């Protein structure tokens, strides 16, 4: 596998062999555990994945085709592999690699090629926050991903909403993330206002997974005393009434989180 990896890495340099090498290296992410440092330390490799991404910035009127999106999504998945490896993560953050994905989190395009990109880019960020490492939490705080997550949570696909809510949740769950969001009223209210709108949309178009993650964000906010005092007055009716009785019928975890949340507010 190692010899194939170096050949494919080299084959990224000619445009006739480039796509096939991207797809082949991507297939090795599930089976070669050292693939991330191999990619990170091979001269030019990261630069070649980043080139795939910036080459579609001009495609954001939206002109991205499915072929173009599938190719970049494999570059993104290779970068997710690098984000996930303990030996390469700190340098990925030190090189600000995440900032390259933010245009894909930011576009409002509704085409399916931009949905595949948005989901894979959220996947890269989600792989970082899944580590719960402070370094990751503080980097994302300083780089303004929360406004990007909020806009996606507010009007993305159900699956995009879920991953973005998960990212915001992992930041809320950290003590520094919770303190940061509750440090000013404008920060806290932007998050709570977004969560309230989502609760209203969910009442019309229910999703159990998305409701669970929304409820986790509310539960965690009530650990902060100023957020607790605001949610005493503004917690959506729909989290206390029969709005989600049908959807919660089998979810013991969310019902227990909602009970804990109401108890917290007193």
């Amino acid at each position: 596998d190692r010899e194939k990896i170096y050949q494919w890495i080299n084959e990224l340099s000619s445009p006739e062999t480039r796509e096939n090498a991207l797809l082949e290296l991507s297939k090795k992410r599930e089976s070669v555990p050292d693939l991330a440092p191999m990619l990170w330390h091979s001269f030019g490799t990261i630069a070649a994945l980043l080139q795939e991404i910036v080459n579609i910035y001009p495609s954001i009127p939206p002109t991205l085709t499915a072929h173009q999106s599938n190719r970049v999504c494999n570059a993104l998945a290779l970068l997710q592999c690098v984000a996930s490896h303990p030996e390469t993560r700190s340098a990925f953050l030190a090189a600000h690699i995440p900032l390259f994905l933010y245009p894909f989190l930011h576009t409002v395009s509704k085409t399916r090629p931009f949905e595949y990109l948005r989901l894979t880019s959220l996947g890269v960020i989600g792989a970082l926050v899944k580590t719960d490492e402070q370094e990751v939490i503080n980097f994302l705080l300083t780089t303004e991903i929360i406004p990007l997550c909020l806009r996606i949570m507010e009007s993305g696909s159900e699956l995009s909403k879920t991953v973005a809510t998960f990212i915001l949740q992992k930041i809320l769950l950290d003590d520094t993330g919770l303190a940061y969001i509750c440090q000013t009223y404008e920060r806290f209210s932007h998050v709570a206002m977004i969560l309230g709108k989502m609760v209203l949309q969910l009442s019309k178009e229910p999703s159990a997974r998305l409701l669970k993650h929304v409820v986790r964000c509310y539960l965690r906010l009530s650990d902060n005393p100023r957020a607790r005092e605001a949610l005493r007055q503004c917690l959506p009716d729909q989290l206390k009434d029969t709005t989600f009785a049908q959807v919660l019928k089998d979810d013991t975890t969310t019902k227990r989180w909602l009970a804990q949340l109401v108890k917290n507010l007193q």
Binding site: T65, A66, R112, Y116, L119, G123, H213
Partner: peptide, 28 residues
Amino acid sequence: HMWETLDDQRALQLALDQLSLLGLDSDE
């Protein structure tokens, strides 16, 4: 726009695979 060619299927399967690594459907 409902049309799907091979690249649509591939990209969707890949996004789902990537996101299934996150454990969004875990129950505490």
